[PDB]
Structure formats: C-alpha cells, structure tokens
A = this chain, B = another copy of it.
Amino acid sequence: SPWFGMDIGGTLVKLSYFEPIDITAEEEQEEVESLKSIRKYLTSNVAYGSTGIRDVHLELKDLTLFGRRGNLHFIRFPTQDLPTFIQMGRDTVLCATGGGAYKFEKDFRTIGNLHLHKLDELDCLVKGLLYIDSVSFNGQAECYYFANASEPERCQKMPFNLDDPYPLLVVNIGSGVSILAVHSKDNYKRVTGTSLGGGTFLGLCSLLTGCESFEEALEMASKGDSTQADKLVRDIYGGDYERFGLPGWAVASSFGNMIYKEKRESVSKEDLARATLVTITNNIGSVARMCAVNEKINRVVFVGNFLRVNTLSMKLLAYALDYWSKGQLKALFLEHEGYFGAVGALLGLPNF
C-alpha cells in the first residue's frame, strides 16, 4: 500500500506522498499493476485533472523514512473536489487529519476495505513542522525570516536556525486562524484563534472585486493602494498621534474612508483588494503579538496557505511584528508552510 498523509481542510486538501526509490528487483515484480499505475501517475504528472497540483519545488529528495529511502512529494487540490478524488480511488491505510477527516469519514469508507485513521489537526501540524525542520529542505534551512524588515533597500530573506525550537508560537493561517503555543515536542496548547483568516481575504475580495482566484486577488492587491480605502491616523489627527506613539501612516480604521460616498465611487478594485489583504494581515499580526506577549514567547512562526506565493503579506507581517513590538518579536516563515499537517499524518502510519 502507498504511504500517504492527508490534511483535509476547510478550503484545500493537502497530500504528502512518499515515493520509494530503493525498489529492488524482486519488490518491483511483487507489486500490483494498480500500485504501479498510481506511482507512475503521481510522479509523471505535475497537474492532476483540472484542479490538482504537485508542488515540485518542495520535494524532499532521498529522505529516509520508516527505514526506506524515497522522495517526499507535496500535492494539493480544493476540498470542493474531494468527491472526484474519492471516485477516482474507487475505480490501504489512510492517515488523515483536518476537519474533513471527520466530515468525510463515511465517504472515505466507500473505498472497500480502506482503513481510515483520523488524527488531530494540530497534533499533526506540530509533528510535521518539527520533522521537516529536523531533516532540512534538501540541506537548506526550512525556516527563514526577513532581515532588516524595516528598510526595503536592505530587507531580504535569510535562514533561521530552529535546532532548539522551544518555546514557539505557531500561527496557522488557513480558512481561519489558529494560534498554538509549543513548549516541547509533547506539550502544546491552542492559545486562541480568529475567524479573520485566508477565507476572509478571498471571500471579501471576491465580493468586492469580482476576482475568481486566490492568485488573481493577490495580483490585484499588488497593483492597489490600500490608503484609498483605509482611514489613517493622519486623516484623523493631521499627523502623528504623538502621545501614544501612533505614526501618521498607521491605519486607524480599515475601510474607514468608504463611509464617504464620493470615495466609494473613486476607489479601484485593486485598491479594495490591497485594503482587504492589509486589513487581514495586520489583524493576524496584532493577534499574534498579543498572544506572544501573553505566552512570553518571542519567536512567532506563520504557516498555512494564506501565505503561499504571498510575499506582500509575509513582508507586512515581518515589518509589522518588528515595528509594533519595538524589536522584541521576530516573524518566522517556513518553506513547507501549507503541508505540515499532511506530513504529520503520514508520520502517524507506524502506529497502525
């Protein structure tokens, strides 16, 4: 049976697949054509159907897992298309996490004899994050930050060492946001969450701009000026609010200039996309900072797929966390940010 780990989220299904590369002569004979067809289908295609994608650049090559050498592959598709995935599977032991492991349990069991083992979505996140950091990204650091995040002429991605990862605040930005405090490999808590997450960005963007993909929303936002929609401190005070250290450029009221009809009539879709992105990202950063101060943790790592191909939000988080914390907190990022739950699920396989 193939070794798969699956994280079925509110928006995306993430799949980690271990392809063995040490297949001996006898093992290849004693393999059923169905298994060979699966392996060849997955390794010879980068798109699967109309909505599945293999993230080839994330592949971990020549990993030793469960005593075998192989390549770890990372695959995603929308949860909306899980019926297609299951139907293909109908025409093995599955470690699955995320809410969909529960919601679609009965659907997975329409696959004859399949054994479904549900694992907790935050247990899997912590286990997968710690594992990937431990084995490295093909010899490169899994974890990085933006050095000198306050000056754009200097700001650059740089590696960060997590050899002693504890304590750690993990901010998981998916459909919503979950915030975890990790104190040891077996001691962690869900501190809180917020419902202003990636699904809010995409949902509001679609309502406001008519965009029909995450990537299109980001492209619009890169062209926009959020200050056309937001009311800034300087719009209220005429400058800084000096007494409490609020600079004139800080947002006082997100979308607050949209209470004026003439401003609603002149704002562009790109401006509204950028204001949505800035609003969601700043709120996540601020909640992360408050949790970090309360948990007495100074390293904050952001994961989840809201940040995939989203350098705007990563740089905003890096700058905002550093600026508003007076340098006490650092925003950390991970190359495999969307996939840790799926890896953690795969790692649960020996228990079954």
Taking Cβ atoms with an 8 Å cutoff, the residues of A that contact B are 9-11, 80, 98-100, 102-103, 120, 122, 175-176, 190, 192-200, 202-204, 206-208, 212, 229-231, 233, 235-239, 241, 243-244, 246, 250-261, 264, 272, 279, 282-283, 286-287, 290-291, 293-294
With A283-B283, A286-B192 in contact, do A199 and B259 touch (Cβ < 8 Å)? yes
Which B residues lie within 8 Å of A290 (CB)?
A: 192, 287, 290-291, 294
Given contacts A202-B258, A202-B259, 16 further A-B contacts (CB under 8 A): A103-B237, A103-B238, A175-B253, A175-B256, A176-B251, A192-B290, A195-B250, A195-B251, A196-B279, A199-B255, A203-B257, A203-B258, A204-B255, A207-B272, A283-B283, A290-B294
**A257 partner residues in chain B, CB cutoff 8 A:** 203
Taking A10-B231, A10-B252 as contacts, is the C-beta distance between A102 and B238 under 8 angstroms?
Answer: yes
| CB–CB B176/A253 < 8 A | yes
Alpha-carbon separation in the docked complex, A286 to B193 (Å): 9
The reply to whether B258 and A207 contact each other, CB–CB distance below 8 Å, is: yes
Whether B236 pairs with A99 at a CB distance below 8 angstroms is: yes
**From A9, A199, A202, A256, residue with most partner B Cβ within 10 Å:** A256
